Amino acid sequence: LKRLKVVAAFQQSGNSPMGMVLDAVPVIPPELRPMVQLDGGRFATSDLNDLYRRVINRNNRLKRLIDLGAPEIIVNNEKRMLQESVDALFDNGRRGRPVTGPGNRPLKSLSDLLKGKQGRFRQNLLGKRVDYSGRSVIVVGPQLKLHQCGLPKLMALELFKPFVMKRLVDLNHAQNIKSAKRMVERQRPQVWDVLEEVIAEHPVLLNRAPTLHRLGIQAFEPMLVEGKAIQLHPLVCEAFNADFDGDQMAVHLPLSAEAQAEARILMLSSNNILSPASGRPLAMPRLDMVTGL
């Protein structure tokens, strides 16, 4: 039954088993295996280039031996070496010693580019780095309402940069769009009055890691604040498992109508008051409030 799985798979699909043996090895585009100059006149290459380079050296030496009619033992040596170098290029370390670079490190092969939380799947497809986002230290700020957060001025200005730019040009503060950009970058005073305008009623998502459950990301209405710290309503602490002993948090600016609507409706701080695990409220008074009441 084990062997039949393979055989029947090869006959039920019209592809032949010949594909399991390569006469030709493809080469990934060079931008996907970059090479960059570094301070010091030295270069940094992806491991893929060293692997392809060993494949090339061994194939060329094999061609040289075959032309020179070398002894069969030496040509067999070169053939085994070419095979092993293609083994490295495809999946290094799977058979025998891994091909190493300086400092004895195994060259990450085309297989490694896909495995683990480092590989393309878990590092670049199931999660990414995103624009319109920032991060800073959180402080308490008990003056807030549940749906609100203190967003620093210097954060809001960068996060909304194109919005404030379009507004700075709407009103005559900037005569064109390049001046709008330079104005936001020089932090000319006119931006600030405009800032409070664009950020009005424009929700933001706040996230604290580790995101253990969906309440680890919650939308708030931003209140422009004095200082360089995010102000976090004292009742959402439980949901984030946030204390104020140095914790930091991340800010994400939803752009499209649909994203803003999902933020105001699905993820609004005050619309997520109950633990989605137990159904009971999480946003209750905690410790200080308790001793108060």
């Binding site: 301070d39 992806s46 194109p162 005569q175 769009i177 390049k178």
Partner: protein
């Protein structure tokens, strides 16, 4: 995996660098100071300036366009360059072209 600090360091001495989406958005939008200076010029001056100065067509080939001899095209080119230098005088100072 070459690092971000490494991509960035390299970009510091490169001819293009790691360009932002915004940078490329603005390059695809009009340069308002430039667009209006060009629209000021007469149509034929603007065309003879556009082809030669932006699209780098050789003078006989830009004569092949517009269906006008080489002399007409070069008169239009030099005089439109002059006029557009009449305008754009603050833009050249705003940018580094006054040096």
């Amino acid at each position: 995996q070459i690092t971000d600090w490494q991509l960035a360091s390299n970009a510091e001495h490169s001819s293009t660098g790691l360009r932002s989406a915004e940078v490329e958005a603005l390059e695809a939008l009009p340069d308002t100071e430039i667009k209006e200076a060009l629209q000021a010029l007469p149509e034929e001056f603007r065309m003879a300036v556009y082809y030669a100065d932006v699209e780098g067509f050789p003078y006989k080939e830009i004569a092949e366009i517009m269906d006008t001899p080489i002399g007409t095209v070069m008169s239009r080119l030099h005089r439109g360059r002059r006029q557009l230098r009449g305008l754009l005088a603050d833009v050249a100072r705003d940018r580094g072209f006054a040096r």
